[PDB]
């Protein structure tokens, strides 16, 4: 069915997105270590890498919203509505994280530790929020694969 096809694309997207989120977390941790150690060139590299993974998470989140809306058209279902709303909240959250990371990139580039530290802590806080939403989304998708 088209519903099975869409669900199969969604499972692949979310599997890929979780790997990318792991990469984003590792790059964020490495940036934090460089920052603590006063290694500004390492820090700049790790922020660029984090931003690369962040841009990829953002695109997976876009794809997930699109696919869940497509699912709702062919296979209306309480769970699909619920998933789409979580996915839309995640998309907003990851975009906010992207903006905050950009602020951290610019602050490091400008050598403004105070602006950097505030942005970087906000980035991590958004990551905790996004992680919760991603967990909620994953559970909703599991409940969708059992329908």
Ligand X SMILES: CNCc1ccc(-c2[nH]c3cc(F)cc4c3c2CCNC4=O)cc1
Q: Does 21 bind ligand X (CB under 6 A)?
A: yes
Find out whether 31 and 46 touch, Cβ atoms under 8 Å: yes
Q: In whole angstroms, how close is the CB of 32 to a second copy at the nearest point? A: 11
Kindly give, in sequence order, each residue whose CB lies less than 8 Å from that of residue 100, ignoring residues fewer than 6 positions away: 119, 122, 123, 126
What is the CB neighbour count within 10 angstroms for residue 107?
Answer: 19
Kindly give, in sequence order, each residue whose CB lies less than 8 Å from that of residue 60, ignoring residues fewer than 6 positions away: 13, 14, 16, 17, 20
Q: Does 64 bind ligand X (CB under 6 A)?
A: no
Q: What part of residues 85-144 is at the interface with ligand X (CB under 6 A)?
A: 94, 97, 123-124, 126-128, 130-131, 134
Binding partner of residue 126 among a second copy, ligand X, none, CB cut-off 5 to 8 Å per kind: ligand X
Binding site for ligand X (CB under 6 A): 21, 24-25, 28-29, 54, 57, 94, 97, 123-124, 126-128, 130-131, 134
């Amino acid at each position: 069915s088209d519903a099975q096809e869409i669900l199969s694309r969604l499972n692949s997207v979310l599997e890929a997105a979780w790997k990318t989120i792991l990469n984003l977390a590792s790059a964020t941790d490495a940036a934090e270590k460089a920052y603590k150690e006063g290694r500004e060139e390492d820090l700049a590299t790790y922020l660029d890498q984090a931003a690369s993974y962040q841009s990829q998470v953002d695109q997976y989140a876009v794809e997930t919203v699109r696919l869940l809306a497509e699912l709702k058209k062919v296979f209306p279902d309480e769970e699909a509505d619920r998933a789409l709303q979580i996915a839309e909240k995640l998309l907003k959250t990851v975009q906010e994280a992207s903006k905050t990371l950009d602020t951290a990139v610019a602050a490091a580039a400008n050598g403004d530790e105070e602006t950097f530290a505030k942005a970087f802590n906000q980035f991590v806080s958004l990551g905790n929020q996004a992680d919760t939403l991603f967990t909620q989304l994953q559970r909703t998708l599991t409940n969708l694969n059992k329908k």
